[model samples]
Target: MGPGFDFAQAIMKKNTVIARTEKGEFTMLGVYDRVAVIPTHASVGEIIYINDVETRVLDACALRDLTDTNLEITIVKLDRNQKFRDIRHFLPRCEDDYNDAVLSVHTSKFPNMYIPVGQVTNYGFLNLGGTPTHRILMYNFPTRAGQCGGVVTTTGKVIGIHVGGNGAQGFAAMLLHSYFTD
Candidate 1:
């Protein structure tokens, strides 16, 4: 999904596309190694737009089970019949800890720019659907309310996906180690 407010603003361009859940907005992150990563809250058959072109979800599942965690994520496979050329790719780089600084897309304005969010200030858990999952936190990160599913990167490598946050801090779903294995 796109950044919450900025994405909405950036999308005002003539060719910018938008994606969304049934009632909520969604942003698609760049390809991760090979597959595209998105927030897992989307339902089956939801439609997302690309450059005003229509794309439909074919299948979607969590990279890991949600049996006992609050990590809301979904790996989605779109209608492959269409071609995508401008999509960005977020290279994978799961670290035991975050670096001194990281970058994220801020789309609130006409020209989107990547901004620096400082080192991981705190780590915690989120209770999504009665499941507790890992959450990476940072203080005073530049993001809008409801801005979820934007990629967070360090030195050009993806560290996690921005999930949600308050004005005081931001939260992300720490990359699942097992995701790269099997």
Candidate 2:
């Protein structure tokens, strides 16, 4: 896959949706084969809604373990998802493999036109719970409110899913497809 164009052409909205939970809504990135990833405190195995449409949560990290990780799974409900156009595969099997990438954010508040392209500093977690050992990527850019589960891409490939942080630092979870494979 190649790139270099307008911001609107950068992020394919089809592969992303607003995941609606009882708590609130956050961005959800759609990977290959009807699978979607979201990093949030939403309960896994619970029925949630996607962009106001009823859907299911495949899995997630426990609420008590939020300090360590806040990742989750939801069924890919995006209707416009196409074969190669809408989805370019999840770009799995990568860990701390890039120095920079582009991440897209979703929000009704403003266009933000939120796609923060920044350098990937490292791959790990803050380790509050320090058990499961959630591995997330740290990027040198500030994250917005609605981008809890945005897609991070490099060289037109999916590298990870944006997690949290509002300051000059951002966090993300990489290799999400590994969870489904195992």
Candidate 3:
């Protein structure tokens, strides 16, 4: 869902919470509209901490045929309050493209700062049985385990979210070209 945020004023701190699951906590993105994005493989348990509030994973976009397209996005519907009302939501644009030739991968590691890393490979399409194919990306970025849901941008505009990837190869799901069409 194209839920209604800021990269320019995007907080340099960790926007997401460590989904302290029975397995482990996966630190992912902090999104607006009471919705968030993470990797399908990320093990989110029954507990989540945010704004001094505790909640469980209500609706997480999961699938059985994961990796079928070599890319799968996990969306979590958050039950938050007005404290999150002040949070920034980066509106990903369909028009904004990434620097595929060269790139800078964002990370939540090394503690609280936008550090640069990696090179982008290519852009592809995802068949979600929609009117047209959804945009996706392929890259050779050196991303860590909890780096999922990191936004990809160009010229200070959010173009997509880094879903999941290993060192050798990775994937990012871009905004639909028609998302912001107006």
- lDDT score, candidate 2, position 45: 42
Candidate 2 global TM-score: 0.70
Off by over 4 Å in 3: 1-15, 50-53, 63-71, 83-90, 93-97, 100-109, 118-121, 125-135, 166-170, 175-182
Q: Which one wins on TM-score?
A: 2
All models, RMSD in angstroms: 6.4, 5.0, 7.5
Q: What is the per-residue lDDT of model 1 for residues 1-182, given as tens digits with 9 covering 90 to 100? A: 33433432332222122355564555555343324556666553566654345677666667544455545667666664543432243334343556544434333331354446667654766664355665555546756744566556555345577776666677777654455442
Instruction: Select the stronger candidate by TM-score from 2 and 3.
Output: 2
Tell how far residue 97 is off in model 1, in angstroms. Answer: 1.7
Task: For residue 102, give model 3's deviation from the true position in Å.
Answer: 11
Write model 3 residue lDDT over 14-85, tens digit each, in one string: 344544444334445555556665555565555665433587666775432223453355667776653233
- At residue 27, candidate 1 shows an lDDT of 51
Which residue pairs of candidate 2 clash? Answer: none
Residues 1-182 of candidate 2: C-alpha lDDT, one tens digit per residue: 22522332455466666677775777666655555666545433457676676765444443223474433333333333342233534455555657457776675543334465667766565642233435667887767676766777765567777666648777776644455451
Count residue pairs with overlapping backbones in model 3: 3
Predicted model with the maximum lDDT: 2
Candidates ranked, most accurate by lDDT first: 2, 1, 3
Model 2 scores worst on lDDT over the 10 consecutive residues at 77-86
